Design a protein around this nucleic acid. Structure first.
Ligand SMILES: NC(=O)c1ccc[n+]([C@@H]2O[C@H](COP(=O)([O-])OP(=O)(O)OC[C@H]3O[C@@H](n4cnc5c(N)ncnc54)[C@H](O)[C@@H]3O)[C@@H](O)[C@H]2O)c1
Ligand SMILES: [K+]
Ligand SMILES: [Mg+2]
Ligand SMILES: [Mg+2]
Ligand SMILES: [Mg+2]
Ligand SMILES: [Mg+2]
Ligand SMILES: [Mg+2]
Ligand SMILES: [Mg+2]
Ligand SMILES: [Mg+2]
Lengths: 109, 58, 70, 161, 51, 39
RNA sequence: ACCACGAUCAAAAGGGACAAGCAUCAAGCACGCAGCAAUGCAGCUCAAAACGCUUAGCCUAGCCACACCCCCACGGGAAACAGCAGU
């Protein structure tokens, strides 16, 4: 009722930024193999409107469905950047981190 | 939950955590460090799982 | 180990090398005709492309190189 | 640029009173009277001081990148003279691939240090190709023709409109 | 109500994390002091041999 | 094969059954051209 | 309902999903994006199988496709049982 786009909220990795104000994002879902009964990753490509062109290749982003498609393949918009590439902020503690190590200690604050 | 997009990330933060994105746009953060898998299941079932009453009604 | 299989491989290979020696000249003509036809096919595919695009002729200055002639 | 030959060895630079010695001793304890390895060590120390936050920590990814960059420069200098040294060509290519992997990890983990490493060492990071397939004569010629035909189609469309 | 409960649980786990991190920092301080003394001794020996 | 390889390859693809002299038909009508004997 | 408020049913349009074999079909050749437009950028799909050839009505309270042929049917070939009985 709010949108004609099937996928409403999706999380992906940005794999392309060569289009103006548009980010090419790779979204992985878990699909059960009918024979092996094991979950494997299935990939799909989405084009997300990035008005400010703040997306970099490799960062994890959240995409929200547009009310209607603004182009043939652009049906989504960048709601936020969940993880900036190489600039991750730990949501649990709110401190910068490099991989599994704290760049700034939680105790310091 | 076949229609819920589940995605995994490895060695990106010093501590493990779960994040749920809701249709309203609200985000639920669950810290799971020091917790057993059964505890995580119970917690997520309690906070975002349908209760048995709704399942029996369905 | 299978010495029959290796001896069968030897006989098959030796017989094959006799055939190519006997018909070496006929093979060369077949190969050159095949290369001619393959070049013609490549040119036809290129022409199909610029015809479907809309151009009535080839792109200006373009000449289909001979990529198969030795 | 290489360190000047008068520079002291890495192990003989903090010795007390090393400036109060004779000129002959200074020459003997300099890069002029040493193999290329000491000179590469001096490059590594200089790069560490110029780039990394803690020059003493050789265990960081940035330090490993600097060391492998020095090694790659040494291999390239060797191969300029030794064109037919296949083993050293292999070593150079393998080291380049390893440095690319380390740079990818650094970019994924610490972007600020990644930028500092890229600027300091003059490394231009490139993303890997998506597909690995031979570009034979037929494909290359066909792709060139397709690009030309697209250009001509664009010109004609501009003329029509 | 459930969201508020989850947030409270997160805060409790954060307090426990702070306590554990403080203990780890104290132990790290002690160990680092020990190895720093050892490195200083090694540096002194290295410098003596060079002199 | 590993589970990943099995998932990649997928279910076994059985080649189509070979058609015999009757071409998958019970019987066939025919006209005799010549009769003879074989050893 | 018919006074519509709306329910039921269900086209066109938009999003998603959706058969089999062959990779000795490996590249497709304009397949994208941004801007009110003017126009600008050079991009888009693809070994997680694009593009292509071949096979087959299907997921059966039923559904899809066809209604002699040229996909279609202004038009042409031409004069139509793939309705029942029948030849
Ligand atoms: N074909 C690619 O360009 C490509 C790109 C990314 C990943 N891969 C991965 O490589 C594996 C092999 O794929 P395949 O059986 O279809 O190739 P293949 O062996 O059947 O050969 C076809 C093409 O794939 C290339 N190829 C083969 N092995 C590769 C590899 N390990 N990495 C990259 N390219 C490779 C070959 O150069 C060739 O051009 C797969 O797991 C695939 O996910 C392949
Ligand atoms: K028809
Ligand atoms: Mg419809
Ligand atoms: Mg293959
Ligand atoms: Mg063949
Ligand atoms: Mg049929
Ligand atoms: Mg009929
Ligand atoms: Mg018809
Ligand atoms: Mg009838």
């Amino acid at each position: 009722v709010r949108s004609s786009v099937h996928a409403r909220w999706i999380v992906g990795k940005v794999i392309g930024t060569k289009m103006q104000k548009t980010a090419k994002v790779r979204v992985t879902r878990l699909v059960l193999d009918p024979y092996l009964l094991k979950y494997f990753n299935k990939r799909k490509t989405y084009f997300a409107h990035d008005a400010l062109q703040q997306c970099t290749v490799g960062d994890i982003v959240l995409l929200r469905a547009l009310p209607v498609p603004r182009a043939k393949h652009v049906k989504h918009e960048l709601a936020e950047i969940v993880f900036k590439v190489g600039k991750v902020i730990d949501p649990v503690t709110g401190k910068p981190c490099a991989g599994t190590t704290y760049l700034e200690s939680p105790l310091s604050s | 939950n076949p229609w819920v997009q589940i995605m995994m990330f490895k060695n990106m933060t010093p501590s493990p955590f779960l994040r749920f994105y809701l249709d309203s746009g609200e985000q639920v953060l669950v810290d799971v460090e020091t917790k057993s898998n059964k505890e995580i299941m119970e917690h997520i079932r309690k906070i975002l799982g349908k209760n048995e009453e709704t399942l029996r009604e369905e | 180990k299978n010495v029959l299989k290796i001896r069968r491989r030897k006989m098959n290979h030796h017989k094959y090398r006799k055939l190519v020696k006997k018909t070496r000249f006929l093979r060369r003509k077949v190969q050159e005709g095949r290369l001619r036809r393959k070049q013609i096919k490549f040119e036809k595919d290129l022409r199909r492309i610029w015809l479907k695009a809309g151009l009535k002729e080839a792109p200006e200055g373009w000449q289909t190189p001979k990529i198969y002639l030795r | 640029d290489d360190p000047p030959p008068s520079t002291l060895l890495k192990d003989y630079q903090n010795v007390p009173g090393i400036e109060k010695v004779d000129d002959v001793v200074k020459r003997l304890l300099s890069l002029e009277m040493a193999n290329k390895k000491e000179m590469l060590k001096i490059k590594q120390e200089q790069f560490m001081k110029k780039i990394v936050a803690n020059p003493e920590d050789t265990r960081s990814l940035e330090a490993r990148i600097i060391a492998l960059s020095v090694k790659i420069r040494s291999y390239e200098e060797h191969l300029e003279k030794h064109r037919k040294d296949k083993a050293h060509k292999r070593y150079l290519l393998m080291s380049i691939d390893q440095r690319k992997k380390m740079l990818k990890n650094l970019r994924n983990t610490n972007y600020d240090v990644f930028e500092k490493i890229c600027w300091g060492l003059g490394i231009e990071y490139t993303f890997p190709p998506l597909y690995y397939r031979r570009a034979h004569r037929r494909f290359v010629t066909k792709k060139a023709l397709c690009i030309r035909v697209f250009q001509e189609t664009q010109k004609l469309k501009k003329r029509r409109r | 109500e459930l969201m508020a409960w989850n947030q409270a649980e997160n805060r409790r786990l954060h307090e426990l994390r702070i306590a554990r991190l403080r203990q780890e920092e104290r132990e790290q301080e002690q160990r680092q002091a020990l190895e720093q003394a050892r490195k200083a001794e090694e540096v002194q020996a290295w410098a003596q041999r060079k002199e | 094969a590993t589970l990943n390889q099995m998932h990649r390859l997928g279910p076994p693809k059985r080649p189509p059954r070979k058609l015999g002299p009757t071409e998958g038909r019970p019987q066939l009508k025919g006209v005799v051209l010549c009769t003879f004997t074989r050893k």
